[PDB]
Amino acid sequence: SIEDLLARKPKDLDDSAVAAFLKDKVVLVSGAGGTIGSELCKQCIKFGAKHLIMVDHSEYNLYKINDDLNLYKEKITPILLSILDKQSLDEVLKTYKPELILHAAAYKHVPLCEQNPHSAVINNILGTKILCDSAKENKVAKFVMISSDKAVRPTNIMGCTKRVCELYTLSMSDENFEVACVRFGNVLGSSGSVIPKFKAQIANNEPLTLTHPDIVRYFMLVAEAVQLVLQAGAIAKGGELFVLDMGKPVKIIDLAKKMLLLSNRNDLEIKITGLRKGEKLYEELLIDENDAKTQYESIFVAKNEKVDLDWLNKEIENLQICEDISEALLKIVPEFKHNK
Amino acid sequence: SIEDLLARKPKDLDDSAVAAFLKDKVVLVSGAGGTIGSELCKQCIKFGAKHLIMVDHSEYNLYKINDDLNLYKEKITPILLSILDKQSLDEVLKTYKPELILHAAAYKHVPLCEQNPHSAVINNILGTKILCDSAKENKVAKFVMISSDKAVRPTNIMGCTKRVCELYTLSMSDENFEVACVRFGNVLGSSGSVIPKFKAQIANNEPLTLTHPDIVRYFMLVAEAVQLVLQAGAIAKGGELFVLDMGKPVKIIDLAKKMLLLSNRNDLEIKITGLRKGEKLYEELLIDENDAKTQYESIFVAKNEKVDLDWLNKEIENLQICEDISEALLKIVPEFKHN
Ligand SMILES: NC(=O)c1ccc[n+]([C@@H]2O[C@H](COP(=O)([O-])OP(=O)(O)OC[C@H]3O[C@@H](n4cnc5c(N)ncnc54)[C@H](O)[C@@H]3O)[C@@H](O)[C@H]2O)c1
Ligand SMILES: NC(=O)c1ccc[n+]([C@@H]2O[C@H](COP(=O)([O-])OP(=O)(O)OC[C@H]3O[C@@H](n4cnc5c(N)ncnc54)[C@H](O)[C@@H]3O)[C@@H](O)[C@H]2O)c1
Ligand SMILES: O=c1ccn([C@@H]2O[C@H](COP(=O)(O)OP(=O)(O)O)[C@@H](O)[C@H]2O)c(=O)[nH]1
Ligand SMILES: O=c1ccn([C@@H]2O[C@H](COP(=O)(O)OP(=O)(O)O)[C@@H](O)[C@H]2O)c(=O)[nH]1
Ligand code: NA
Ligand code: NA
Ligand code: NA
Ligand code: NA
Numbered sequence: 001s002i003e004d005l006l007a008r009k010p011k012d013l014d015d016s017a018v019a020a021f022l023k024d025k026v027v028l029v030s031g032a033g034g035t036i037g038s039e040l041c042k043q044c045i046k047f048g049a050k051h052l053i054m055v056d057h058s059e060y061n062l063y064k065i066n067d068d069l070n071l072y073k074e075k076i077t078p079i080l081l082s083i084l085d086k087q088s089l090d091e092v093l094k095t096y097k098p099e100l101i102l103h104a105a106a107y108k109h110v111p112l113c114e115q116n117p118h119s120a121v122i123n124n125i126l127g128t129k130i131l132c133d134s135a136k137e138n139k140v141a142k143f144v145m146i147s148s149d150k151a152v153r154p155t156n157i158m159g160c161t162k163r164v165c166e167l168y169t170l171s172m173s174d175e176n177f178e179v180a181c182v183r184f185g186n187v188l189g190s191s192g193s194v195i196p197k198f199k200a201q202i203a204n205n206e207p208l209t210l211t212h213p214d215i216v217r218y219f220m221l222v223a224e225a226v227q228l229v230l231q232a233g234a235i236a237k238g239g240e241l242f243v244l245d246m247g248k249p250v251k252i253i254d255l256a257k258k259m260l261l262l263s264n265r266n267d268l269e270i271k272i273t274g275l276r277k278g279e280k281l282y283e284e285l286l287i288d289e290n291d292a293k294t295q296y297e298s299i300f301v302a303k304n305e306k307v308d309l310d311w312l313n314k315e316i317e318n319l320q321i322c323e324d325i326s327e328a329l330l331k332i333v334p335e336f337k338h339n340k
Numbered sequence: 341s342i343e344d345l346l347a348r349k350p351k352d353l354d355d356s357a358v359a360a361f362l363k364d365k366v367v368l369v370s371g372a373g374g375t376i377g378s379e380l381c382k383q384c385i386k387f388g389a390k391h392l393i394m395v396d397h398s399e400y401n402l403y404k405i406n407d408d409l410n411l412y413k414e415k416i417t418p419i420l421l422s423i424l425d426k427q428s429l430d431e432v433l434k435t436y437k438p439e440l441i442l443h444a445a446a447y448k449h450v451p452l453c454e455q456n457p458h459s460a461v462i463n464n465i466l467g468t469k470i471l472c473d474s475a476k477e478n479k480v481a482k483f484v485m486i487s488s489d490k491a492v493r494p495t496n497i498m499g500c501t502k503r504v505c506e507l508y509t510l511s512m513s514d515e516n517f518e519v520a521c522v523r524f525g526n527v528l529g530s531s532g533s534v535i536p537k538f539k540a541q542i543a544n545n546e547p548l549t550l551t552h553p554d555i556v557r558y559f560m561l562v563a564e565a566v567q568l569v570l571q572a573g574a575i576a577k578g579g580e581l582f583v584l585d586m587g588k589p590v591k592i593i594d595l596a597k598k599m600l601l602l603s604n605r606n607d608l609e610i611k612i613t614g615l616r617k618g619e620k621l622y623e624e625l626l627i628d629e630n631d632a633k634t635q636y637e638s639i640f641v642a643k644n645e646k647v648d649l650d651w652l653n654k655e656i657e658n659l660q661i662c663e664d665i666s667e668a669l670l671k672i673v674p675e676f677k678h679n
Contacts, residue, residue, distance in 0.1 A: 057422075058398045059447045063532045066452075080447060080456040080463075082397075082422065088458060107399045107420065112406075116420040118428060123420075192403045 021234035023048035031105030033061025113158035156278030178238030185218035218246035361574035363388035371445030373401025496618025518578030525558035558586035
């Protein structure tokens, strides 16, 4: 399949390192039923977590990961909950006392977030603030947030909200509460992504819709990305912004063309539809030449400075009441260049 | 297919009646990306709505229905929102001024709601209260809520929450704000349901897991149930609790056996796993012999009395903070017999 062809096959996957990090821990995964969250759940079981707390606001998604892990039902707890509900979230943290939170709950679709920028701010920034604050207050030892190459020099509301989340979480890290963020690019076959869209077009004998002939993304298999996230969490001392080596860029036109060749469906045309608001032709390359090496060739540490939380909390209040969210986000993230 | 065999094929589908009800309306669908919500969206387009406002808190589900309807993109607005967010929901209603709300946003899984009863109360009862209140304040003309046979003499948290939602919405109905609730049974192949589960077990060479050899449900195709919901909505004058004729009961063991037969995997076993907390062996038959007929053989009107809204609002405030949710629900719904 094209998945196999575009897998990274990282040479530095380290099962025993992840087992050492997770064995007998109580771990809470937010967004547990999502593409990334579900794989985080599966790997928590694989690598020996004692008790997995699965938090998701989407009932089908929660149902499905809980069903997927039914052989391990005695050590998993499905919590149907939005992380915006601080009071209920606090009760969950007190009840189960997780030692690690893996935070994979967010809205990620660039077009939808352009159309719903207030909801993007509330779900992404306020949700992350509530979950991180509750974690620190309830003495969770370590907190790892999933981030995106879209957070790097963002051109869209979504990516900018994720950058604010990096700033907030990293600024909360201290010697009692270790936070790390891990940035990576596209996961092959993820919810609502290009590969399932192309599959559904080819099945239904429809032309493939390509945004631009030159567009490029970086790709990894979900199991590869998630295990590297966990390796990064395992080595983190707190305050690190990690970045993954995604390998070679893939032109989406070559992706489309290969899917057609593999489906034996060269009868179909590829139609160009146009670059959408907020959308990059080439996402940013994640690893900077001055980033720090780790013991894993696929994982580097990027520079980040803490911001003052009094300032950032005030800006996060402003985001909730302001007339112009794009303008308000630019106050927090000076590198934001909104592609309207 | 198993779906074809169990379809109701109601003889009283009426496309022109639904078109007359929906043509050139601004319609908002809550839960727009869900199994029922998505079909409501599709039918709103089919039957001539001017503008469809799609509200859903699940990004993939919203993404998917918006994509499914991409040929109609100029007439649809995807709103990524929980109906619990009153301030933002009010802004949406004030902006788009829908004349009809079709309310299909809820949590429905009986086991998950037994395990998360506070979330079932908040999402189902408070969400419905927020949406219904906002609708009435923003002069929405008509409000139609999807309900369930699980709401009838409920034995589980989920179904009891739905019954409270009926009582609330129907009690809000008045001369200017017409409410209808429509009860029906299982939709064939809905999200997270038995047919997809059995398909996945067969595909992975696994025994089918059957709750109880005698268990039965009533079934309809989603397009059938939704079109009948819309016919009921069209005829509603306000205050009606409608029920659909689901046809004959289906034993889930027969469903399981037919799926094995249809897949030529009679090699697979059917394992009995047991009745779950809150679960009924036979759901209630929806049509009572004293229900009123309508012009559609498939739609009847059940008796319902309004409750005092001051009392019910107080009870709903308590449900949000109480430790004894099962007991508290029993005070609101005296017919609740929690299994
Ligand atoms: N999919 C990718 O290619 C990719 C790549 C790199 C980074 N990421 C990042 O990973 C994160 C998740 O991506 P995904 O692909 O898993 O998306 P997803 O939508 O499949 O998963 C997110 C999950 O979080 C849940 N959720 C959302 N908001 C919530 C809330 N308030 N409370 C509780 N649960 C909530 C959702 O229901 C869903 O199950 C995003 O921030 C995204 O930018 C994704
Ligand atoms: N067999 C059936 O599926 C069936 C039969 C009869 C009645 N019903 C009733 O119909 C309703 C929906 O069932 P379904 O099968 O479509 O379930 P579903 O989970 O597929 O759809 C519900 C949709 O509502 C959304 N949603 C949930 N809470 C929300 C919130 N607070 N704000 C915004 N969006 C929200 C979800 O994301 C989802 O897309 C439930 O009350 C159910 O009991 C279902
Ligand atoms: O119908 C589509 C959907 C996506 N893409 C492109 O494929 C890549 C991956 O898009 P996806 O939605 O999968 O994720 P994103 O990169 O926005 O997170 C991007 O370059 C898109 O422009 C495309 O050509 N056609
Ligand atoms: O793995 C399963 C799942 C469901 N059921 C039964 O199938 C029927 C339909 O269950 P579903 O989850 O589809 O919907 P529900 O009736 O709970 O809304 C009920 O009698 C369930 O007990 C079953 O026997 N095995
Ligand atoms: Na999966
Ligand atoms: Na469990
Ligand atoms: Na007709
Ligand atoms: Na569908």
